[PDB]
Amino acid sequence: DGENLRPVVINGSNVAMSHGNKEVFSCRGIKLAVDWFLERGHKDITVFVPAWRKELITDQEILRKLEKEKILVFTPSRRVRVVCYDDRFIVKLAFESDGIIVSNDNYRDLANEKPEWKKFIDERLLMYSFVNDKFMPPDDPLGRHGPSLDNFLRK
What we know:
By secondary structure, the protein is an alpha/beta fold. It has helices at 12-18, 29-40, 62-68, 86-97, 108-113, 115-124, 149-153, and strands spanning 8-11, 25-26, 45-50, 57-58, 72-75, 77-78, 82-83, 100-102, 125-126, 129-131, 134-136. The strands form four sheets. Strands 5-3-1-8-9 form a five-stranded parallel β-sheet, sandwiched between helices. It has a two-stranded parallel sheet with strand order 2-4. The chain is globular.
């Protein structure tokens, strides 16, 4: 009740994959997005990647530091392979933290589930594009009819 900037929650798996070669998990995509939000002034950032990424993937050592730095968490997975969907962990954290969800995933699945999540997703989803190492969020994140980038990123 004081931090005028919102928390940021990042779908790492989609970011990494949306960086570099479409099929390559280019970790470095996360840090770049984190450096977008750290220079803007955000202190609360969290990036959810499945645990198996620790164990077509480049720069895994990025996921070591961001984890130890309080920014990253490794969602559950194991063998039987089963991977608990990080999708829910992001939506629920961003919902309660009053933050944003950084993803090119529309989250139609979780929106369709319950009407509070559809409202929150459509109002607080921050989409993006990568051009090389240029993490460019739109300055019209809800299209034109919603807030600008600054307004969207702040309480």
